[PDB]
Amino acid sequence: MKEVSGITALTVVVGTVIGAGIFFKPTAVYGAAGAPGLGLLAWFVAGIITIAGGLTVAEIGTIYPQTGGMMIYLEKVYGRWLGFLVGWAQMVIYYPANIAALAIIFATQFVNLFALSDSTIVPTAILTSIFLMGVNFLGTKYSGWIQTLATILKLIPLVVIIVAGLLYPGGGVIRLVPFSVETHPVLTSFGSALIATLFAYDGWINVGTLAGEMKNPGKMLPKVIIGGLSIVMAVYLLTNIAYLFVLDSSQLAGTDTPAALVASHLFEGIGSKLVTIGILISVFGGINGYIISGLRVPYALATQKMLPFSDWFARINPKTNLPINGGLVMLGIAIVMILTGQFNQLTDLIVFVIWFFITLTFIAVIILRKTQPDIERPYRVPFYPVIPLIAIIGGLYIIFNTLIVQPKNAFIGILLTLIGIPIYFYCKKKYGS
Template identity: 30%
Template sequence: MTKLIKEIILKNHLNNHNLTREIGLFSAIIIVVANIIGTGIFTTSGFIMEELGSPQTMLLCWLVGGLFALSGALCYGELGAMFPKAGGEYIFLRESYGKGMAFLSGWISLIVGFSAPIAAAAIAFATYLLRALPVSFSFKTAVSLGGIDIIIISPVTILAAAIIIILSLVHYHSLLLGTRIQNGLTIFKTTLICVFIIAGFCFGSGSAANLSGELNLGSIFSDSFAVSLIYISFAYSGWNVVAYLGGEIKDPGRNIPLSLFAGTFLVLGLYLLLNMVYIYALPVKEMSGVLEVGKTAAVSLFGNNISRYFAAAIAIGILSAVSAMIMTGPRVYYAMSKDGVFFKLFGKIDSIHKTPAYSIFLQATLAIIMVVTSAFDKLLLYIGFTLAVFAMLTVAGMIALRIKKPSLERRYKTFGYPFTPFFFILGNLWIIFFSIKEKPVVSLFGLGTIGLGGLIYLYFKKSGGTIHTGIHVGRNRMKIIAICREVIEKN
């Protein structure tokens, strides 16, 4: 009888199509780097310089923002090693606070965390790539309602939608193909940044005098420093990406915390060096308020002829970030569906490709809608701060798990505990406070979005979750009965 039960369990397990662990340490680090380095580092430093007015204070602000991200990565490493499953924050918050808080995190991830940034990054990619081409395309068709453009068709939106479709199909095809393309794009992007840094200092027409001056530590507690930190937190966002892929990481107890730390630390170093190049290239007045600070610095260092090549390089760099987000996001919706708090369809794994196909297509559809409606900028403006809220709650949940469940196996424990999590929590509270202070509409719209997520969760809990669970259990019973019959007939 024991042998019969073992055969039943084994066969039922083999018939259950799960995600496969194919991502090694190197690929995991590459994904972290790819997901962090996007448009932020090439566009925010000019606004930060305008706020702070001091090169030394700007570099300190980038360092502090990097330390916040690094402390978060150290904390997420412990959670990822404890719960090496697909879903990231959704799984962590579920274990700490229950399904309700976890669903709200997944809801925010679906709209603000992935779909909207994918749309924004895809449009940025298309804009830079078209700028790099020797020919120009300028047609535009819009569908208007009440004088407002609802749908916009242009070369930028067409190219942005096309790249979302292409990369979504790549990551649908297989995890192996997706990671190989991701690795190639990220290595190319990182190499370009390193070449730009070295060439800028060695051959560029900059001035070391721009880097001189005194650092005023008192500025850390100013409103301008806090506002600048908000910009920088966006540029560092994505440091937690590997936690979402926990179900596909090899040796997760070791590789999740190590890749989170190594990838974030590498980006911190690159960001500081890149900003030093910007300062070396541009005096404070020329940098202040400049949107395309990366391009402006490149022109100042190497002349106008570099402009088109730099635009192409940035486009490739952004492509890497788009790919990383397309790979990561669907694992959250997959985990939500498996828990019965999202449509069952999105918890299915393609039996041939072993990827969450329907979740990938859902995300691609939402991102394309945001591209053609230009809704992504409004989403990012009004509810982007909620990502900091849930990251803070996740780390607070790690502390709660230490207290409530001390017996849980922890292959890795957060370095510097309890200072590290408290540093991260206080840093995010600081960012959230000044986000609300500077843009109060953000908090109102964010609360409204979270409230809407709560209503949707109640719907799934009362109807969708029950139906999902009933069907799931019923099908499992039928499988077990069928397997029992098959085994008995063989014997």
């Protein structure tokens, strides 16, 4: 404990993960668990999964010190195609739906606060995404200016919700007593529950690039993933107890803006409005921060042969230093996704899709341990086979449980991942344009 070099990194770990997740997901988690008790474990196990996932992905992250992440872990053990399919889905599914989902949910909350028509959600989701894509092409003056406040004023609506929520007048241990209900049976439920809590835990993957950047890693590096994601774990459980102290299972699942309602009970008048402003900020900072780290992918495929208009995609505008053309493609496919999907449907794709490759990455660490067990390992996954296999065990479990629950979602991501198999090979002989 107390290394000082890494309490700075720990900031990141908490910040990368924490955001707009807890503020909107309960609606899904309780609408699937059908009981407070089962939903509350899903946040714990998903968290215990990613503390697992995070430590396994750091070994491959230290073998390959790079900011590219996965795009390169997967080429390096699974060949140029999987280095590609990773990015192809990142560029066509993951980034566009993460803009999309969040922009939708924003508008949703905007209409909830400034009590407006529930028709005018999509136009607002369009215009936030269109605005923030545009604003990002102005430069990292503004993009980053949104980010700094978005990190200050995402922790305050929480610390204010936990304090008061846990202190709610009608409340205590009884406010989570139905553990597993028969209307929502445990197995079908825990699969739709984990995939909804795992969206809140998202961005934990960035630990590979973090460990890449590290200097003399092990010293405190595992403590930073342990401590980091367990502070996130700690928070995500504690603010849920607060939500269940005010409302409960049926009620949370009821409005698609859960935290916003618990706000309006916890505080009367503008007090609770100041909390929802904090939420709309938290959502907007994510949208923007996703765009920010989104423009990186189409460009890295434009770095290689991998994309049809590689020259147009790789264009960094000499003014801003950003490949805006990647984001104009991602704005389009995000906009189709806002008009075609529904927030939870989308936030589900995202967990399924990414974990299809994330698994591969952990599997890869164990592969790597047998391909070149003489490569240099600055950080090595502790309790060696246990935890990567834990992450795999839980990883595998999601991709099978989403298949079997959401067959359409499992196919939209699969249609769109495998629509890139032709793409890859067209522009490998031709090399793009």
